[PDB]
Design a binder for this molecule. Structure first.
Ligand code: UMR
Length: 127
């Protein structure tokens, strides 16, 4: 399925080239510009654990998730990953725990040492 495919066929977008965050672009977005540090970014997303369970979805809330890019307001992989996206892009990310919740996990949905899958759509970004 999609998690296996990004695991096996994704591109390493980490600066360290340690394969901690792999990406596939599923829907090409608009133009060439990606957001800049500190921008307000608006995303829709859905996340799955490695046991196949959905652990979250903004779609199901009928409102986007909004954060300021590059400020550690989200897991490291999201700051790295969303920074690579164009407006209107849909991407898959496959994230090792060192770029997510590590050994601590995040109670009560995300276990210790969890590799995560996301589908993310970058709706908009604004300074
Ligand atoms: C619930 C919305 C955020 C949560 N955060 C930031 C964050 C803020 C406070 C505590 C833990 N994590 C995040 O960094 C990431 C990435 C952005 C989308 C969501 N998460 S998340 O989907 N990451 C596995 C998530 C993270 C948790 Cl603890 C619960 C749920 Cl239901 C979903």
């Amino acid at each position: 399925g999609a998690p296996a495919t990004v695991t096996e066929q994704g591109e390493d977008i980490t600066s360290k080239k340690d394969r901690g965050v792999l990406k596939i672009v599923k829907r090409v977005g608009n133009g060439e510009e990606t957001p800049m540090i500190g921008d307000k970014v608006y995303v829709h997303y859905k996340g799955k654990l490695s046991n196949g369970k959905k652990f979250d979805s903004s779609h199901d809330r009928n409102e986007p998730f909004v954060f300021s890019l590059g400020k550690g307001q989200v897991i490291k992989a999201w700051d790295i990953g969303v920074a690579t996206m164009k407006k209107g892009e849909i991407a898959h990310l496959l994230i090792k725990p060192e770029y997510a919740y590590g050994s601590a996990g995040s109670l009560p949905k995300i276990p210790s040492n969890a590799t995560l899958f996301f589908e993310i759509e970058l709706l908009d970004f604004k300074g």
